[PDB]
Amino acid sequence: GSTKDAFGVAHIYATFNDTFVHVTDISGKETIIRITGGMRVKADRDESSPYAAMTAAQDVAKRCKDLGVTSLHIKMRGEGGVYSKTPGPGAQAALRALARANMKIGRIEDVTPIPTDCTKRKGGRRGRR
Amino acid sequence: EPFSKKEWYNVQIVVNKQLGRVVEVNLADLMENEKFGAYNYKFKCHGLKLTTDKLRSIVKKWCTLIETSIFCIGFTSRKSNQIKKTSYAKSAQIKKIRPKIVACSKVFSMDNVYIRKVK
Amino acid sequence: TAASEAKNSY
Amino acid sequence: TSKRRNNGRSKKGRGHTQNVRCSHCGRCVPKDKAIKRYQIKNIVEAAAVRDISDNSYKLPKTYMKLEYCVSCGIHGRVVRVRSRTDRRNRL
Amino acid sequence: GRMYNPGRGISRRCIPEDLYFLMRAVSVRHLEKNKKDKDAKYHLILIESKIHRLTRYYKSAKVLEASFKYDA
RNA sequence: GAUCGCUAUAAGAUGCACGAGAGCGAAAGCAUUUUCAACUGUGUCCAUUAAUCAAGAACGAAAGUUAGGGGAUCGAAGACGAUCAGAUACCGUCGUAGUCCUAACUAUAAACGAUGUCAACCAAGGAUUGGAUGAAAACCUUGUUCAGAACUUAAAGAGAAAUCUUGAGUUUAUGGACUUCAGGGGGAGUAUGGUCACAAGGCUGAAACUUAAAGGAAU
Chain E (3-32) residues lying within 8 Å, Cβ to Cβ, of chain C? 8, 10-14, 16
After which residues are there C–N gaps above 2.5 Å in chain C? 7
Neighbours of B107 (CB within 10 A): 15
Residues facing residue B16 across a β-bridge: B6
Asked if the Cβ of residue B16 lies within 7 A of any atom of strand F, the reply is no
Please give the single-letter amino acid code of residue B105. Answer: S
- Residue B4: left if φ>0, alpha if ψ -120 to 50, beta else—which one? alpha
A26·B23 Cβ contact <8 A: yes
Distant-in-sequence, close-in-space partners of E55: CB < 8 Å, separation ≥ 6: E19, E64, E68, E69, E70
Chain C residues within 8 angstroms (CB to CB) of chain E: 1-4, 6, 8
Please tell me the distance from the alpha carbon of residue A108 to that of residue A33, in angstroms, as a whole number.
19
Checking each nucleotide's C1' against the CA of E61, the nearest proves to be: F49
D52 and A84 within 8 Å at the Cβ level: the answer is no
- Give dist(CA D55, CA D45) in Å, integer: 15
Give D22's DSSP letter.
-
Q: Is the CB of A36 under 7 A from strand F?
A: yes
Query: Residue A13, exposed/middle/buried by CB under 10 A (0-12, 13-18, 19+)?
Result: buried
Closest nucleotide (C1' vs CA) to E13 is F42
State the Rg of chain B over Cα: 20
Closest-CA residue to A15 (of A43, A38, A32, A33): A38
| Beta bridge partners of residue A22, listed in sequence order | A11, A34
- Contact criterion met (CB below 8 Å) for A3 and B9: no
B96 CB closer than 7 A to any strand F atom: no
Compute the distance between CA of residue A70 and CA of residue A56 in angstroms, rounded to an integer.
16
- Cβ of D19 near strand F (under 7 Å)? The reply is no
Residue D87 three-state SS: helix
Residues A88, A23: contact at Cβ < 8 Å? no
Q: Which of residues 1-10 of C touch strand F (CB under 7 A)?
A: 1, 3-10
Out of D38, D57, D63, name the one closest to residue B57 (CB): D63
Probe site for chain A from D27, D54, D72 (most A CB atoms < 10 A): D27
Nearest-10 Cα torsion for B12, B17, B22, B24: -20
What secondary structure, in 3-state letters, does chain B show? CCCCCEEEECCCEEEECCCCCEEEEEHHHHHCCHHHCCCEEEEECCEEECCHHHHHCCCCCCECEEEECCEEEEEECCCCCCCCCCECCCHHHHHHCCCCCCCCCCCCCECCCEEEEEC
Residue A19, strand partner residues: A14
> How distant is C1' of F49 from CA of E29, in Å?
25
Quick one: DSSP state of residue D31?
T
Phi/psi for D38 (5° steps) reads: -100, 115
| DSSP output for D39-72 | EEEESS-TTTHHHHHH---PPPEEEEEEEE-HHH
Helix (H) or strand (E) holding A37: none
Chains C and E touch (3+ CB pairs under 8 A): yes
Q: Cβ-count burial of A53 within 10 angstroms (0-12 exposed, 13-18 middle, 19+ buried)?
A: buried
Q: Beta carbon of E20 within 7 Å of strand F? A: no
Task: Give burial (CB, 10 Å; 0-12/13-18/19+) of E21.
Answer: exposed
Which bases of strand F have any atom within 7 Å of the beta carbon of a protein residue?
A: 3-8, 12-51, 58-61, 72-76, 90-93, 99, 102-103, 113-115, 117-122, 127-132, 138-142, 144-153, 161-164, 166-169, 176, 216-218
Q: Do E and B touch, counting CB pairs below 8 Å (3 needed)?
A: no
What is the Cα gyration radius of chain E?
A: 15
In the 8-state DSSP scheme, what is residue E47?
Answer: H
Q: Which residues of B touch D63 (CB under 8 A)?
A: 56-57, 59
Q: Which residues pair with A8 in a beta bridge?
A: A72
* Resolution of the experimental structure, in angstroms: 3.2
| Distance CA D15 to C1' F189 in A | 30
Residues of D in contact with A86 (CB under 8 A): 62, 64
Helix or strand run (H / E) with residue A3? none
